[PDB]
Amino acid sequence: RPNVLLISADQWRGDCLSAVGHASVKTPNVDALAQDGVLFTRHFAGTAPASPARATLYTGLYQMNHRVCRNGSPLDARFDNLALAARRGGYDPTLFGYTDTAPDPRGMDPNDPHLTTYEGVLPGFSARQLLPEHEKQWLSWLRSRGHPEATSRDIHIPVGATPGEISDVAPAYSKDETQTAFLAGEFIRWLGEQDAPWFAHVSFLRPHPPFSVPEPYNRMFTPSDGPAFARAANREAEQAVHPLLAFALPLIGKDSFIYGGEGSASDWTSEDLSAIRAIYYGMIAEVDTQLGRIWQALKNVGAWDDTLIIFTSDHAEMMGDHWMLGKGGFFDGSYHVPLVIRDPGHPGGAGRQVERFTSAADIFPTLCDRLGLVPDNHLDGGTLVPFLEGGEPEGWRDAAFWEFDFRDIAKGEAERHFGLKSNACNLAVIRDERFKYVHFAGLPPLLYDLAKDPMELTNVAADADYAAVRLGYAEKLLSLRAQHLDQTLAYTELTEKGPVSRRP
């Protein structure tokens, strides 16, 4: 019955929405969706980076169940997902962009090109417009628009600017020529062809790096603007808190954030990071405008009040916090993501803001509930429908839970550095309103008193006065571990009258 529109925009911070009180950041179209919908203020990714993070999103599972530890980790073919379930509800789930699903290699022919990347399409989606890392479909679209220069990703370098340098200058393409504008247009054309209830997933790359954007967004924000950075006085002191920080922070490269970047991101100053943030803030504004354009096209076709809109991000961005750029680790900056759900079918909950901890694992259970679908296996998340109704679900979680795995199957760098097996190269986070407890399978734990230290700069795990707090969170995490074991078959019992099952 309703149309479903799942919109994701990569690497977008949960605190970077004007609707949540950001000083600098301007998100009017997200705000507009939240005015008529439910905004989730404590929404966390299941994990990081893109492939592990998206496996939570699409399967409704914690990394302890989906087992997608890194970009390139296969996702078991046994797992149900929102695309496959959508089809059991009579929809044809359609993709615009990417899912970053490494397929299950088992049984697949060794010569199959699908075995060579993590940039595969999630089973169940029908691809209308694909757009991988190579962006060849966008480049060819630019060529058809009068850009014979659009022959490579080099087109991302701002006009006249030095390759690999932070620049406020706009690239050769316009604001109506970004990958965002391209994908939105492709969605809008497809939307025009619809004559029945539709299911679409639009996956925008931006505000994910390279950090370059056309006019006006490039200069829309001043480097001096923006909130304080949640960081230690210096990089050395920051890294001294935990072995993982000492290992990971020096390895962050410039190439990952600026097109043509060379060397360590450690060579960028507080000023350089502030300049990057100004561009990032503009990039968020560019995606927001495109969302407005999507809202209008929905109204124009008369879909607006028949469409369940879910806007979110896979994982977020550190953006200078803790002298870091990118995703991964255990800090809030990398995991706290936006979530705005506009359900015209539940007007009761319109205008509301939810302060209960929510997970990316909750999206698939929400869709199942709302669309009257039954998942084919255990799910880790819970339905958000009671929050959309304007109420609160019974037995809801009281802390955010997420995981991060830093194993290296291909090169074994982290394993050699730490002197650990690949199965001990991980952490689990339990985070509520007062504390953050990080447990590492093979490194020391971390405990942050968010009341005293909201910036997470003081590890109090070894302080004797926090010993009982540390023990409490360790045992809470132990119950979470035990409760989230796979219940796919464990909720069934074979009796004399045949199988008997329980509903979660």
Place this chain on the structure above:
Amino acid sequence: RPNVLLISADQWRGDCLSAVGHASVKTPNVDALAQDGVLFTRHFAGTAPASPARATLYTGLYQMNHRVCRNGSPLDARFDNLALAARRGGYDPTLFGYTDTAPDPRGMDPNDPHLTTYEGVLPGFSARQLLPEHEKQWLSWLRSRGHPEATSRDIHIPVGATPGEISDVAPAYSKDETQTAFLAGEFIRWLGEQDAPWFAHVSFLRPHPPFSVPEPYNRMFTPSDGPAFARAANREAEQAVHPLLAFALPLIGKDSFIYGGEGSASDWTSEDLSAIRAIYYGMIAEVDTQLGRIWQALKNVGAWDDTLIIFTSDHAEMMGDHWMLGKGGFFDGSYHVPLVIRDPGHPGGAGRQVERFTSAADIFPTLCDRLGLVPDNHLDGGTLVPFLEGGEPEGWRDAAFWEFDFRDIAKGEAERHFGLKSNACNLAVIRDERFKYVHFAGLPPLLYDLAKDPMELTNVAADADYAAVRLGYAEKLLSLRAQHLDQTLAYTELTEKGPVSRRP
């Protein structure tokens, strides 16, 4: 190349072997196997009751991975096991007795009789002689031996004795007519037909209850004999230690231990339990005799020095300890099991006794190593081959690990009583030489100082002086949970050159 003989005898205590220094118990044939083999002194079941315990044994997985929680919990069809692997090594794995495998109901026709019981056969085994709970095959064999009275399981009631009463009188059948004597004979006939390397699993019911045995075993031991019972002064003080004990202990029924038993086992006195133990000790002797008959049969055909023998039990028996009878819970009595491996291929370890912690989860990895087989998925156990070689494996575990789940899918009794969801009706045990830490997903934890309290009667979890010990074991258990997550696909990374994998 070698023959494989996996022998299991249900509900046999690890301390009940004369080779380990038991005062009363007489196990000469197990001792004889151990004299020429490796005996494992700290061997623990992966879990209990029979179906959960056997899933660890056959799949080399901890319950956190196989998810077989209760008798009736399905075992996922995706899992590899010692019988499927044996076929990949050119063997025809043959079964005598039972595996207690509830099949994966998915895709199976709802009218299939296999969906009505947990007493299914493990995939990969070819059944030579089946013997389920109904024992109809043994009853018909008795009829053919001149027992027209053998028309029902009533034949287990001792001659003249009152049904449901502890009796040291022998039943109508002889020592050469037990289920043990029947199955051993069937194995011996099959053994004679072998002309190539063979793979057999002989699964004996005894010393599992009803506690009745023919002459001489019935009176071979005096109730007054036997070691001290590891129990509190009374049942009430026992049950007061933990909510699970207060729930479970009153529910133990007489029918589960004596044929025709009625009412609670709480109505049995210290004397009654000592009488039951005397019969149990005799039942162990009856099984040991049949092992000697098997060892002779192997010598007679010339297989003895070409056969890898693995003798063990699925789980143990409480046998009066903690005022309990049967299996389940968290006490040692229910999980410490025998393990004797005779490998003629490794004479370098013969006569040896191993004191490191071993698991039922280690059997399948051991067979894979020894027989040059590769498992099709992640395994939780480790190869015991380095111990058979006469050495020690590098990076072996410092503590025994086991789990127990008490959910009730069919009736929901435990769930209602405790006010817990089915996913929270479980515990995990971490047990070393000095401490036992039992964490419950939804009940209070337990901490036993085995150095001061080897009988497990004093819970010190709440004592402020043990706070750091409690924290240490909680974080150690957290590390295990993270390391034992499914690595089937997580040890693979999809690269430009295709898949790249790591070996555990």
